[PDB]
């Protein structure tokens, strides 16, 4: 066998964290049009048979809180896990409405020893966020 | 026994250290290009190949426009980071 077993009772969960409005004090500007992405992703993963859950404008605390809980759930009858992060960010960092969260932190909740229900199953993280401030000028 | 960091896939919208583009009415370049390729190919291609399609689309069909010279005519390339152990098919 060389391909992931996708015949489990269910394709799995698809968590979409869509942050559009940040606290004034963070200095972070609103991410317009992000609702279009979240609506699109929701419809696409629905037809792929994933149980989708949209969460909007979560604080750093809630983001971690959500990941912690999603990991403690039982994924025995689920084939895979998908997490989509739509927000501001920097290298290895994604912004909660009230402040930054380092990726590694929420990623660890799903690694081998931690989320044994997903062990051996594909954990996919789709991230729409900045990774710094460099601009690509292109060529030709 | 297998690595704890294994079976992970990070599909980033942009390359390491770079900005990422989002359009106010159309959505981010990455997401609208990802959903389009999933719809057309989820039932035909392996996942690593689909994302590659998404790379070509974002890289090819998008270019920023702005009155601010510093941000005008900028390109973007998504970054796939795989630590998967097998091929992934949604069917």
């Amino acid at each position: 066998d060389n391909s992931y077993k996708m015949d489990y009772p269910e394709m799995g969960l698809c968590i979409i964290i869509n942050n559009k409005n940040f606290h004034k004090s963070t200095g972070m500007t609103s991410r317009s049009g992000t609702d279009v992405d979240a609506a699109n992703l929701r419809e696409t993963f629905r037809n792929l048979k994933y149980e989708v859950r949209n969460k909007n404008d979560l604080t750093r605390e809630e983001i971690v809180e959500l990941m912690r809980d999603v990991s403690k759930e039982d994924h025995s009858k689920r084939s895979s896990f998908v997490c989509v992060l739509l927000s501001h960010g920097e290298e290895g960092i994604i912004f909660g409405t009230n402040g930054p969260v380092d990726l590694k932190k929420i990623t660890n909740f799903f690694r081998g020893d931690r989320c044994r229900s997903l062990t051996g199953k594909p954990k996919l993280f789709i991230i729409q966020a900045c990774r710094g401030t460099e601009l690509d000028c292109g060529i030709e | 026994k297998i690595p704890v960091e294994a079976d992970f896939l990070y599909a980033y919208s942009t390359a390491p250290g770079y900005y990422s583009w989002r359009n106010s009415k159309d959505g981010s370049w990455f997401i609208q290009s990802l959903c389009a390729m999933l719809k057309q190919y989820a039932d035909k291609l392996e996942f690593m190949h689909i994302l590659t399609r998404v790379n070509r689309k974002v890289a090819t069909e998008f270019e920023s426009f702005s009155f601010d010279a510093t941000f005008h005519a900028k390109k973007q390339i998504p970054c796939i980071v795989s630590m998967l152990t097998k091929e992934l098919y949604f069917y």
Partner: peptide, 4 residues
């Protein structure tokens, strides 16, 4: 167009 805007940046993230």
């Amino acid at each position: 167009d805007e940046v993230x």
